Paper text:
One such position was residue 26, located in the loop connecting α1 and β2. This residue belongs to the central CORE domain (residues 1–30, 60–126, and 164–217), which are known to be important for the overall structural stability of AKs. Mesophilic AKm contains Ile26 at this position, and its side chain is in close proximity (<5 Å) to other hydrophobic CORE residues, including Met1, Leu3, Val21, Tyr24, and Leu82. Notably, a thermally stable AK homologue from a thermophilic bacterium Geobacillus stearothermophilus also has an Ile residue at this position,26 supporting that Ile26 is important for optimal hydrophobic CORE packing and thermal stabilization of AKm. The I26T mutation in AKm significantly reduced catalytic activities at high temperatures (55 and 65 °C), whereas the activities at low temperatures (5 °C to 45 °C) were similar between the WT and mutant enzymes. In contrast, in the crystal structure of the AKm I26T mutant, the polar side chain of the mutated Thr26 residue cannot have these hydrophobic contacts with other non-polar residues in the CORE domain. Consistently, the I26T substitution reduced the apolar buried surface area in AKm.
We also determined the crystal structures of two AK mutants, which showed the largest thermal stability transition compared to wild-type (WT) AKs.
Numbering used by the authors: 1 to 212
Amino acid sequence: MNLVLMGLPGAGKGTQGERIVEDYGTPHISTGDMFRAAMKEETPLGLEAKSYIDKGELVPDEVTIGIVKERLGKDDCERGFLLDGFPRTVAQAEALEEILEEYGKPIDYVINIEVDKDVLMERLTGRRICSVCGTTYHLVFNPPKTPGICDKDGGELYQRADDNEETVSKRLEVNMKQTQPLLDFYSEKGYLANVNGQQDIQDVYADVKDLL
Ligand SMILES: Nc1ncnc2c1ncn2[C@@H]1O[C@H](COP(=O)(O)OP(=O)(O)OP(=O)(O)OP(=O)(O)OP(=O)(O)OC[C@H]2O[C@@H](n3cnc4c(N)ncnc43)[C@H](O)[C@@H]2O)[C@@H](O)[C@H]1O
Ligand SMILES: [Ca+2]
Ligand SMILES: [Ca+2]
Ligand SMILES: [Mg+2]
Ligand SMILES: [Zn+2]
């Protein structure tokens, strides 16, 4: 399966993406994760992206498309992929169509995890991420079994730098503006499927599993 996840900041892409990869083993490709790994490693690209990321702005298309094209050519994607948070502009989506023609792997589904804008700030400010594997928890909605550490590997959980009220507020503004153009682009292609992202995690995943 060649899958794309989309959704507003905090809508549950990672949470659902993780269950999809567990069940089907498709490599989980998150542009956010990739940029954060570059920033952790202090690579030139990391340092370039950081300026945009710290603001809640989109990293420019050209560099973003370039890291996805390079990633999608790697040998681990031949048995399929799960793309997460790319594309998030029509121009990214067009370039993806071209990239996927080129790698002989057309999109099976675009899954939009639809969540109400007003509930996203509380999802993000309460989010805690594992410093080792990057799985997400929430202090209320999805707590770890042991406070402060990952269930899977005991890594310390932390608050992402961009999960502050100020930066979230910009991330929502920025991505909301791109949302309908992107949903139009993909409903027009016939790949789009919508899921109600405002249910218990397992119930959102039940609905995802049905689509696949
Ligand atoms: N293509 C691109 N072009 C340009 N720039 C790009 C780019 N891709 C990335 N970037 C740059 O990188 C930045 C970061 O991008 P990115 O990391 O992709 O951030 P995002 O798209 O804002 O999504 P998040 O990872 O914050 O949320 P998610 O939807 O994965 O939610 P999660 O499952 O964690 O869940 C959220 C929380 O809610 C909880 N939760 C999950 N599901 C539920 C549920 N059903 N009910 C209640 N709580 C839930 C979780 O426990 C968690 O705490 C961008 O802002 C931009 O600067
Ligand atoms: Ca380095
Ligand atoms: Ca609303
Ligand atoms: Mg994520
Ligand atoms: Zn972990």
